[model samples]
Target chain A: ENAAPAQAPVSDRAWALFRALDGKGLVPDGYVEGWKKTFEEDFSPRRGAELVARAWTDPEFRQLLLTDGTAAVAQYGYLGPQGEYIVAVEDTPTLKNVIVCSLCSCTAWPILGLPPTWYKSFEYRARVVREPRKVLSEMGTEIASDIEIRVYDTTAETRYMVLPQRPAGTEGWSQEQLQEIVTKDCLIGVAIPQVPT
Target chain B: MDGVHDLAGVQGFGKVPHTVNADIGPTFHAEWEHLPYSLMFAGVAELGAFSVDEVKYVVERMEPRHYMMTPYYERYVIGVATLMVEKGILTQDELESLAGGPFPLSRPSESEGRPAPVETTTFEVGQRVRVRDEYVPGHIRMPAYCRGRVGTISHRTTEKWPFPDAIGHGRNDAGEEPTYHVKFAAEELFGSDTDGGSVVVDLFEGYLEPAA
Candidate 1:
């Protein structure tokens, strides 16, 4: 089918879809609101940051996180809809990992929060898998020519988060302190964690 | 379906519209933005009207221009509404009536979806495999760039799920199968044009065969 030529404002159409369903006694009470709250407050990148922090401090956790990411995440109760299966790609001195859903914006939703607008944008989806080094450089992350950049295209059920290499000078830092630098970009592998100067 | 949604390796795009660690605002940027996902869950979890695979396929079924032109969240709203109408739960006229103007939806699927391949072989980690160079005019998880391409499997999903092709079209034969983390050299996917090292695609077992 072709796109409808023109229609009402998107907001009106979106609300109408909701009201149509709600009027039929189909939607559970407060169901949408509950999900909205979960999406806004419960599901977040901070959970992913916390996981990265723990993985950095605990060698056993780092192993578990790299080997069995789902279990590691479930241990923290971060498993949910789009996060049923977890895979943590590790960045090493010679190799770096990045994740993108080139098909659509499939992501580790429960942990990384819903994808950022840019992550879902067509430009990111189109360019990241092909010219990731240039894409990352444009986004302000310069990878050494020696390190291999691996881009993971999320096309199926598996979800991914990047466990960025810990920056130097953060030795003996508390988990909370380390968590602040592991921003959403780091988890997405667009940026490495930065320890303040 | 080989729609515009399969954007991997396509060319001529500009810079991504973001910077490192930019201060992204609240999760829900607009008030109505949350409704699409919330209602999609209502359809899937609450009403059992359609599977999530169906939602994705419907979005792909959107007219290419519509899909390219529409914003992200609004696309879901269009997809979910299309499912409602397609499933007979709602009507296009009613949707337009409620909106007080026209409300369009994704095009109907051209396929009823195929049953999962019963003759498929199980793959192991580190196995060499090639994505089957076949095309279907329906939903498929394999991106176009990797068709007929070879790669090494880094991992096999411990768990299995229903094939998207069957479930996406509301078919009953969506047998469960695991996916493989298929890693290809950047040269294999983009030749010398790419500046990256490698690309890993999480591929459904049905899309792969032992590399000859």
Candidate 2:
């Protein structure tokens, strides 16, 4: 039999590594589980959606979000790992914004949730910065010719969340109703908010 | 180091495997998906064996072919395992013995990583800046597409952080410095081939110089 066939599955290796260090009392009790809980429940895009909705409805909050996103996010207690520094990029009449971590999938986990598999794919990391319009269009959102597509590569510590412009139909929608349309994709800037037909 | 991990602007890749607002389902697609991050935090928080930057650089040190073939979370698993072993906290033999098979880890680091620059320009918003032309053999936050390119500073971070090159290798000289949001025109980064308008990269101060 080939030697390669004898190697263990990745799951085994992963657990083995964990058990090795954990067995030695290096891992604090419930430490891994605590992080698991945090990742599972505490960090979510709903938090970002809530912020976006509030910003759309409140001019004061909107100004605060655009100028000092970290403080704005802190007001909601959404600051945590990979999200300590927050910057909200606004989508305007003639500009659209998108974010990518070309080096790795460094995301604002607390507010934006963990990055999706597609976001971490090599195709996305390689293609988005070079040709954002084509990439976004292929991903089902086409930017108009006159609109400037700005791609933000989170190469450093800055974590970004896109603040999508409110759509035409939702003139007097409540914050909760507006938040429903602000999906994770809207926060990621791959999609704009769509009102019902 | 300029490794295969730095994938921005490289040609020949196809469309991203997603549509706008597609349902990705649960955060942990597989049970094992959570281990890498959890264990990484264990290593950082409990053991203090390595920095997060070290974990990132270790993933970059993986054999290029292996890295390309492995999934994202698996890369972190391998990186964390390699760090534990490197820090003398565990051994590959133990890992393989427990798994009853091969458990490959990232390759050894070639560079010791560089210290943060003692002298760096404190740039401000609206000032024109140029990315430095120097090449780093270890971890760097400046992407290849924007290197040596001129751009305007949109914002400078209020806080500073350890330089990635210094911290990624577990070096002790990682001085704190803020990063900049440098906005470059798409034409500046990709010549006439790009369909986009502009690109903004968050870069460390050491990687930039005042534009002419």
lDDT of 1 by residue, B122-200 (tens): 9888889999999988998999999999999999999999998899998999999999999999999888899999999
**lDDT (10s digit) by residue, model 1, range A65-179:** 9999999999999999899999999999999999999999999999999999999999999999999999999999999999999999999999999999998999999999999
Per-model TM-score versus the true fold: 0.99, 0.98
Distance from true location, Cα of A139 in model 1, Å: 0.5
In the range B43-159, model 2's lDDT, one tens digit per residue, is: 887778888999889999988878888899999999999998899988889999887789888899888889999888999899999999989988887888888999999999999
Candidate chain B TM-scores, in order: 0.98, 0.98
Clashing pairs in 1: none
For model 1, what TM-score is found for chain B?
0.98
Q: By DockQ, who's the top model here? A: 1
Instruction: Give candidate 2's total backbone clashes.
Output: 1
| Highest lDDT against the true fold, candidate | 1
Q: How much native contact recovery, as a fraction, does model 1 achieve?
A: 0.89
